[PDB]
Amino acid sequence: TLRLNELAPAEGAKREHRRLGRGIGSGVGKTGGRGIKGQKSRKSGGVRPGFEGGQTAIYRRLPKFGFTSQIALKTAEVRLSELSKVEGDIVSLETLKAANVVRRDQIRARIVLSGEITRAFTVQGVALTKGAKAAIEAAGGKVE
Amino acid sequence: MNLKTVSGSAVELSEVAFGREFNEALVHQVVTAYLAGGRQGTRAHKSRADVSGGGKKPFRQKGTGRARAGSIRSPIWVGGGKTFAARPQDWSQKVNRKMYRGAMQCILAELVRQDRLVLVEEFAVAAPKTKELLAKLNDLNAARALIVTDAVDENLYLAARNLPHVDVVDATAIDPVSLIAFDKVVMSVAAAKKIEVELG
Amino acid sequence: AKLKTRRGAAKRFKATANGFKRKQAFKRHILTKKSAKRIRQLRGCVMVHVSDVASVRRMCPYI
Amino acid sequence: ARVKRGVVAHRRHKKILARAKGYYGARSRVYRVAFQAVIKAGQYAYRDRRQKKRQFRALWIARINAGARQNGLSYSRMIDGLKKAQVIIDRRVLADIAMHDAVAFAALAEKAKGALA
RNA sequence: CUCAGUAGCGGCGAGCGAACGGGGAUCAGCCCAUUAAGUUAUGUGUGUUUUAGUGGAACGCUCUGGGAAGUGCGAACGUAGAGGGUGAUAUUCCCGUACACGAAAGGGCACACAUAAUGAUGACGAGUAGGGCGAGGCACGUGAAACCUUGUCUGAAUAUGGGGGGACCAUCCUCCAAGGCUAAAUACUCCUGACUGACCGAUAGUGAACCAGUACCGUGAGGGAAAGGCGAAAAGAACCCCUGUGAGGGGAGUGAAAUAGAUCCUGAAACCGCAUGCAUACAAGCAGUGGGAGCACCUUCGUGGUGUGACUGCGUACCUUUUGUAUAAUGGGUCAGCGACUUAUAUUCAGUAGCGAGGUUAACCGUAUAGGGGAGCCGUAGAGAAAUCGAGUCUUAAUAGGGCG
RNA sequence: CCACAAGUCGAGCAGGUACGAAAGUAGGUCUUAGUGAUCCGGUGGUUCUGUAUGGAAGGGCCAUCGCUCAACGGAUAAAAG
Numbered sequence A: 001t002l003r004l005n006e007l008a009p010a011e012g013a014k015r016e017h018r019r020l021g022r023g024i025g026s027g028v029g030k031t032g033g034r035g036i037k038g039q040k041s042r043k044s045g046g047v048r049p050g051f052e053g054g055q056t057a058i059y060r061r062l063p064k065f066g067f068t069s070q071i072a073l074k075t076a077e078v079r080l081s082e083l084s085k086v087e088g089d090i091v092s093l094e095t096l097k098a099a100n101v102v103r104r105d106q107i108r109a110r111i112v113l114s115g116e117i118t119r120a121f122t123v124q125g126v127a128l129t130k131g132a133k134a135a136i137e138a139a140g141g142k143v144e
Numbered sequence B: 001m002n003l004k005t006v007s008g009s010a011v012e013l014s015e016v017a018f019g020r021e022f023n024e025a026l027v028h029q030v031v032t033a034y035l036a037g038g039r040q041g042t043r044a045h046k047s048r049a050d051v052s053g054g055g056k057k058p059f060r061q062k063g064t065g066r067a068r069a070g071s072i073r074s075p076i077w078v079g080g081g082k083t084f085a086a087r088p089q090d091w092s093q094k095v096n097r098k099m100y101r102g103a104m105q106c107i108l109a110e111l112v113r114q115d116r117l118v119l120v121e122e123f124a125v126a127a128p129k130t131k132e133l134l135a136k137l138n139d140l141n142a143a144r145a146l147i148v149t150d151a152v153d154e155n156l157y158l159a160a161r162n163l164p165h166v167d168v169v170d171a172t173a174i175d176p177v178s179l180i181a182f183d184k185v186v187m188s189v190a191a192a193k194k195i196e197v198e199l200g
Numbered sequence C: 001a002k003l004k005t006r007r008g009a010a011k012r013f014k015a016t017a018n019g020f021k022r023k024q025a026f027k028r029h030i031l032t033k034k035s036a037k038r039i040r041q042l043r044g045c046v047m048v049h050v051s052d053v054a055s056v057r058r059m060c061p062y063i
Numbered sequence D: 001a002r003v004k005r006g007v008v009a010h011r012r013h014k015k016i017l018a019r020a021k022g023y024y025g026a027r028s029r030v031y032r033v034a035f036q037a038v039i040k041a042g043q044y045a046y047r048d049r050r051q052k053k054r055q056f057r058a059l060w061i062a063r064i065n066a067g068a069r070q071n072g073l074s075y076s077r078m079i080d081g082l083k084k085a086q087v088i089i090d091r092r093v094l095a096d097i098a099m100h101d102a103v104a105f106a107a108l109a110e111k112a113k114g115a116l117a
Numbered sequence E: 001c002u003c004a005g006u007a008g009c010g011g012c013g014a015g016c017g018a019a020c021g022g023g024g025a026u027c028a029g030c031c032c033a034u035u036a037a038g039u040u041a042u043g044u045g046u047g048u049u050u051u052a053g054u055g056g057a058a059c060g061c062u063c064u065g066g067g068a069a070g071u072g073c074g075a076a077c078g079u080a081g082a083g084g085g086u087g088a089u090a091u092u093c094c095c096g097u098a099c100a101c102g103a104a105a106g107g108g109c110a111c112a113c114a115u116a117a118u119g120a121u122g123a124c125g126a127g128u129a130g131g132g133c134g135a136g137g138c139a140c141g142u143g144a145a146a147c148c149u150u151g152u153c154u155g156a157a158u159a160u161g162g163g164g165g166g167a168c169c170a171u172c173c174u175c176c177a178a179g180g181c182u183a184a185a186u187a188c189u190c191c192u193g194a195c196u197g198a199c200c201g202a203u204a205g206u207g208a209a210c211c212a213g214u215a216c217c218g219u220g221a222g223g224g225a226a227a228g229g230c231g232a233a234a235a236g237a238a239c240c241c242c243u244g245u246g247a248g249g250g251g252a253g254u255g256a257a258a259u260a261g262a263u264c265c266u267g268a269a270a271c272c273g274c275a276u277g278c279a280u281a282c283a284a285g286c287a288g289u290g291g292g293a294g295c296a297c298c299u300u301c302g303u304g305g306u307g308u309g310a311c312u313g314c315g316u317a318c319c320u321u322u323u324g325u326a327u328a329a330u331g332g333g334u335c336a337g338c339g340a341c342u343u344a345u346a347u348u349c350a351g352u353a354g355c356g357a358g359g360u361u362a363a364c365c366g367u368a369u370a371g372g373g374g375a376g377c378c379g380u381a382g383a384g385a386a387a388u389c390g391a392g393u394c395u396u397a398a399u400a401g402g403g404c405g
Numbered sequence F: 001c002c003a004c005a006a007g008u009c010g011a012g013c014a015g016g017u018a019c020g021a022a023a024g025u026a027g028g029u030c031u032u033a034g035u036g037a038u039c040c041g042g043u044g045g046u047u048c049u050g051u052a053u054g055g056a057a058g059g060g061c062c063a064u065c066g067c068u069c070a071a072c073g074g075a076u077a078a079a080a081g
């Protein structure tokens, strides 16, 4: 035990890799699982993803819709349970960023009623949902 | 946990660093990762594009009765390119911080319970003499051993340099392969305390 | 290299909780001849069929 | 990690050629021909392990027929008579006795025709 | 390194593909005519480095053997147990290694002074900014197209002034173009020194281990090979015999070995001889297979072993491609050697290990697989085109109904 | 009903209607053919967005218009020997 020639991995951790075209007995000899002839049997034989043989594809016979909002890319959603990572009792955008629950380039945050909290927090400048506000006040915090 | 040094003194060492249950799969993964990270991986071959010459078509496509050929450096031909030419490779693996620490803790605990770890209050040599170090180790009955000290004295390092099956390392420079390879590990109490603080 | 999104498919599909939603065809024009029921029932979003979900996943790997 | 094939390939070819000993011409000298010849020999042996049982049963039946006709019976009637007499000696032993012991076979035929009567 | 294959561009196809912000490496500013930082030369001084080199520990007996470094028994050195060689495998036989020393004379670099010279025809920027026409560059294909460059035609204001903030206007914010110089972090290897390899070992590895860009081919540009090994030491065979004073061989001699004798280690296969045993000149075919007499040698004397195989039942090769092949459809004269599912990145699923409502670092630092580095990524919440709300949300006049959760 | 994209029938609820004295009937025509996806554009509306801010341009959403794309799942805006 505990020698360089007495260490082994757990069962099922390692498998042999598949080797094609090495005889009848291996079961993947000759054609190597590619079947007989055709486009897919050639080297680099697959067709482009989304190609359906020539008919108008699924992503082209359907219409485009919608537009992308720019403010959504900078609005951040925060779970209530994530407040436990905040050091101190003041919950603000800066302290959430310091706790790494909000990415540094975000300009605003919203707190949703997802988990549970026990500490009493003071929330300054962050939007709260109706459930999250009740949860904070029940736990003993206040808003601004 | 309570351990006994060679002189009968009692030492208190944390169970986290020196008493973890042995996890062979974790230890094996970390050890093989260390061995793989030891590789150099310097080599290459020449593909059909790299071999000298071979730009022109050797003979015409039809009419000669030969098998059709495109270049004399084809990988089918003797002296042609290698089909899949190798390039230098990087053999390092990622090891999770917690996985490395847990493997080292398991190794240390297993050494303790197999009685291959020997604790000493102090381990120093007066002069850089190979014979001095040899006699000192023969007294402790650890002629083949890895010595771990809090700091590596120059005299000790010089005395140990020429001895086969003996190496001396700092407490902060232990590695899983060397902990397993040597027959015994002779550790000073200060080095043991430093390793305790590091928790493996 | 990183997988590249097929941008047309990205413009046609958006992800829901357990699938992908899409708009319906046959509402862009030629609308007078269509009955009121078709006009109101071809409005809104529907789900991508399970036969096409795999292709959509291959085309849009990051949504 | 370059691997040279010579030792193992030579061993395999030599084993095939050793199994092909005694065959005519290229069948015992040339690897391709010899390899085709060994596989076909195995196929023939597999088929003939089944054919052998039929051939030996036919031989036993012919010898029993000759003995029965020496004793005044046909093979089919003698088999039927033994069946009715409850004798369960098989055709191999019956043919052995027919070939090597005429008196015992005469007694067996007498028992068969006594059961037939 | 991230942001991010995101925002966008695109016969809105195939594809192309940012920036802002954040984390690191390195950090540095100085001037426009009395003119700066800096750079380059020459000389002097100091320091360091480099071009020859010197010393450098410690082993005996015994057995096998042609030969000892190998066996068995004891001993010594180690700041030296890296490596190479010596008749087989050596810390103590040799060259070396650790370590301690060493330079008439020359070269490189670093710092400090001295003198030159440069920076430096330039003094706040007019045929310039802007505009019309045609093109080019920007992730951005004329698009709602800002911004940069200009071939052509024009053309300001000039600090109460001018440029930008993606058509454009107003307001705010921010900078000062039409004059310059500037180290580091970055890119590379013809070449020099040291060291290294889960890189090759003569069809491999450079085309080339060898008198190779040679022989050879071509008018020429150009193309382009094959070819390594006696033995520890030549001790490379005096002399005799056959033969043409040839080639070649038989003795002799050397050698541990000559079937190591010169294209000489080992010495496979295809292919070609000689010798012995059995079968074979009245019998029709993929050449075998299942039976089976006789003969020869051996023998444990047999219900045995080896070789052969009279006679007999059955039996039209292999691969590929095909509805289907003995097919008179394809491919292979034979042997030996080589010859085809790989590598990097991303992503998804399954096993397995760590940790677990959490998991995990990247670049980078680090005498460095450790330890630091939390930027970022994934999970923890959906609905909606979106603004917005949020265990709900969208649609609607509707708390009805319905869709996604 | 159906590979997808599509196609078909529909009781019932709310609002506003028409015809009936009323119970009621009516979401085109006895039914099954009379048709064309996506892209790009035009028109009406809009308690959506709007690249510093207020606007605007542009975009989104709802309704609707431009095909013998008839080789009628339509490879190009654009093609004979």
Ligand SMILES: NCCC[C@H](N)CC(=O)NCCC[C@H](N)CC(=O)NCCC[C@H](N)CC(=O)N[C@@H]1[C@H](O)[C@@H](OC(N)=O)[C@@H](CO)O[C@H]1NC1=N[C@@H]2C(=O)NC[C@@H](O)[C@H]2N1
Binding pocket: E234, E237, E262
């Ligand atoms: N019982 C039967 C009795 C029968 C009776 N007696 C009849 C009989 O007996 N007839 C004998 C006939 C035999 C045969 N016909 C004679 C023959 O052949 N003479 C050959 C005469 C000339 C010979 N060619 C020269 C030769 O050898 N050059 C080589 C060559 O340049 C090269 O080698 C290779 N490979 O490239 C080089 C590489 O090393 O070495 C050289 N040489 C070296 N030697 C040295 C060595 O050893 N150490 C040191 C160094 O000097 C080495 N270099």
